[PDB]
Design a binder for this molecule. Structure first.
Ligand code: C1D
Lengths: 11, 27, 251
């Protein structure tokens, strides 16, 4: 949702 | 073995805005 | 948290956010009891009635945060789950009895002024502190009211432990020993309570004996958010202390 994007490396 | 001790408070001998409330309750 | 207030930076170096990958969103609160073990409420991972049965490879653990939405660069640390552990005698069918669970990370997290583990109670500690009237502290990124919406930064609220009798007369749900309620009476004036989104978070008490913080309860369930006459029920960590130890010993 309204959350900032988290770096790909963690997904 | 070093839990419950916060780097930015207990560690520097600093209290927070309300922790006292808890102590004052343990009457 | 309803009727709470913004937390001070580093006020909860053990607070954890259970993050849902897709779609990215807050799942539950949690607490760091070890550099590799995180404790949380058991209904955050499993709850059939709502078709909730999250698999380990479905979440992320964001530790060291103050902001709810922003990826606080250079501070927070996101970790991956290796194995989820739910209490084998967890009553998701009736009253959420034994609503506890652990989460072993794949890589240990590095402590700092923002990330530090909390102490688990011992029979003695638990004995002298778990008493009606003795306030504890609850913190989370949940709703601000029962129905603004979410907060910007971590919320906090100090609440007083309530007597067994009172708790039981405030609901129709079967209140067991593995749980205790906390909150202010309608007359008492003060309010406050956890709410949807706060589940899993840590209910702690600072020991006046050695000034170390302890997690006595785990935010479990409730009927409405901050209603007079209504209280909040938290998992009684120490009573479930044995299962916790066993799970970490064996693994
Ligand atoms: C609304 C909340 N209020 C609080 N003070 C603290 C946490 C809160 C979050 N709710 C999440 C957990 N909950 C889940 Cl899975 C199901 N039913 C809940 N409440 C309704 C109920 F009647 F009390 C209840 C209790 C136990 C089992 C089933 N239903 C509940 O609470």
């Amino acid at each position: 949702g309204d959350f900032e994007e988290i770096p790909e490396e963690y997904l | 073995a070093d839990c419950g001790l916060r780097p930015l408070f207990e560690k520097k001998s600093l209290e927070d805005k309300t922790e006292r409330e808890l102590l004052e309750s343990y009457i | 948290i309803v009727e709470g207030s913004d937390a001070e930076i580093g006020m909860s170096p053990w607070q954890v956010m259970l993050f849902r990958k897709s779609p990215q969103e807050l799942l539950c609160g949690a607490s760091l009891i070890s550099d590799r073990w995180v404790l949380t409420a058991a209904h955050c991972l499993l709850y059939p009635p709502w078709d909730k049965n999250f698999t380990e490879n479905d979440l992320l653990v964001r530790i060291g945060k103050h902001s709810r939405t922003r990826y606080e660069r250079n501070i927070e640390k996101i970790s991956m789950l290796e194995k989820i552990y739910i209490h084998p005698r967890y009553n998701w069918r009736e009253n959420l009895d034994r609503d506890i669970a652990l989460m072993k990370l794949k890589k240990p997290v590095a402590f700092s002024d923002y990330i530090h583990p909390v102490c688990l109670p011992d029979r003695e500690t638990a004995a002298s502190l778990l008493q009606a009237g003795y306030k504890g502290r609850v913190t989370g990124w949940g709703n601000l009211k029962e129905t603004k919406g979410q907060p910007s930064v971590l919320q906090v609220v100090n609440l007083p432990i309530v007597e067994r009798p009172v708790c039981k007369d405030s609901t129709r749900i079967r209140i067991t020993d593995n749980m205790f309620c906390a909150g202010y009476k309608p007359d008492e004036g003060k309010r406050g309570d956890a709410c949807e989104g706060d589940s899993g978070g840590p209910f702690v008490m600072k020991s006046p004996f050695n000034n170390r913080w302890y997690q006595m309860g785990i935010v479990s369930w409730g009927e409405g958010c901050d209603r007079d006459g209504k209280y909040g029920f938290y998992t009684h960590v120490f009573r479930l202390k044995k299962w916790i130890q066993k799970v970490i010993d064996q693994f």
